[PDB]
Design brief:
By secondary structure, this protein is mainly α. The chain contains 19 helices and 5 strands. The strands form 2 sheets. The chain has a 3-stranded antiparallel sheet with strand order 1-2-3. Bound molecules: the ligand CCCCN1CCC(N(Cc2ccccc2)C(=O)Nc2ccc(Cl)c(Cl)c2)CC1.
Length: about 350
């Protein structure tokens, strides 16, 4: 599995292609269906136990990973997955003849499609597949663009189609350059690894957003930003990838869709909990009260019916558990607080708040 065994290949390859099209995650995370995954869509286990997932990962990588891997380790897992996808293509009577006929770059494009939509999806493209086998590249490209595939992921699909049309990596070289040049507009001139405050302000100005708006925090959430103070190059590239954007105009068009996600099950809670770590000083375990108040006012205004009294109470540090539980309190509390359970192991801060707020 050593990547050195692949040094004779091009530096552009199927892993790099899928890193651009589907994204790379170096820490264990839950996918859509809630399953522990890592790398480029590598499912670790269906077990609810993170410890189980870590055991599988330590097993596959051959070291104590603690749930974090390097890009090279992710490529090793991915290459195993490619090998299995290829084996399947080669048993598929519809896909084998096409695959066999293609050059290496165009084979990568076909494998990309199989990763996205499975063999049955890809096999359904009967005319386009025949065109590819006959080297009718421009016709194949025209037909593929009329599909539901194209409508679902137009930017990815356009790159894959261009790869069929040309047999070159140009669409991926162009994407990388576009993202690099966009990133360079925002990067800290003294630290190329991040965008600092001046760059975040420029980013917000380019998106026509007030930095203090909830939209900006929603963006941070979608980019999984570690801290309000900076926006790393990795975060920027991973988020633009996951959102399928290569331009500010495309990102701007995506913001309303991010905002809509907050209505899906559990997503507001995920956003709310995200806010705590994002807002806090990294060197600290807890969140300074003044900063907690600022973010509570941003995210809970119009949701927490006692927010104004909460402010008054506090104006007379916050740990993660207390932050988290305020949302639960907000959700369960009656309009008159008459259903508060003092034995519910709420934070002392909330017990004290209820005692303060009832006389008001
Ligand atoms: C409740 C009132 C909060 C007020 N401030 C707190 C700092 C916020 N901040 C840093 C920042 C951005 C632009 C201009 C000046 C400072 C950030 O939000 N960073 C940030 C960091 C990373 C990303 Cl991806 C994004 Cl979108 C934003 C913006 C809102």
């Amino acid at each position: 599995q050593d990547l050195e065994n692949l040094y004779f290949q091009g530096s552009m390859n199927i892993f790099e292609m899928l890193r651009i099209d589907e994204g790379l995650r170096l820490k264990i995370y839950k996918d859509t269906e809630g399953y522990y995954t890592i790398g480029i869509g590598h499912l670790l286990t269906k077990s609810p136990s993170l410890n189980a997932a870590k055991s599988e990962l330590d097993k596959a990588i051959g070291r104590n990973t603690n749930g974090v891997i390097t890009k090279d380790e992710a490529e090793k897992l991915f290459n195993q997955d490619v090998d299995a996808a290829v084996r399947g293509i080669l048993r598929n009577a519809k896909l084998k003849p096409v695959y066999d006929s293609l050059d290496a770059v165009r084979r990568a494009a076909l494998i990309n499609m199989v990763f996205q939509m499975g063999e049955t999806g890809v096999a359904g493209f009967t005319n386009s597949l025949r065109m590819l086998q006959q080297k009718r590249w421009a016709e194949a490209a025209v037909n593929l663009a009329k599909s539901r595939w194209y409508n679902q992921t137009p930017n990815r699909t356009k790159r894959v189609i261009t790869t069929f049309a040309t047999g070159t990596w140009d669409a991926y070289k162009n994407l990388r350059k576009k993202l690099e040049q966009l990133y360079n507009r925002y990067k800290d001139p003294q630290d190329e690894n991040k965008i600092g405050i001046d760059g975040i302000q420029q980013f917000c100005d380019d998106l026509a957003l007030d930095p203090a708006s909830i939209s900006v925090l929603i963006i941070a959430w979608k980019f999984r930003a570690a801290t309000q103070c900076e926006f790393s190059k990795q975060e920027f590239m991973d988020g633009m990838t996951e959102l399928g954007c290569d331009s500010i105009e495309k990102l701007k068009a995506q913001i309303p869709k991010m905002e809509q996600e907050l209505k899906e099950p559990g997503r507001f809670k995920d956003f709310y909990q995200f806010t705590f770590n994002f807002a806090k000083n990294p060197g600290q375990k807890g969140l300074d009260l003044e900063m907690a108040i600022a973010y509570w006012n941003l995210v809970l205004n119009g949701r927490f019916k006692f927010l104004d009294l909460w402010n008054k109470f506090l104006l007379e540090s916050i740990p993660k558990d207390t932050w988290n539980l305020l949302l639960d309190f907000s959700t369960m509390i009656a309009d008159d607080m008459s259903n508060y359970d003092e034995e519910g192991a709420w934070p002392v801060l909330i017990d004290d708040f209820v005692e303060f707020a009832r006389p008001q």
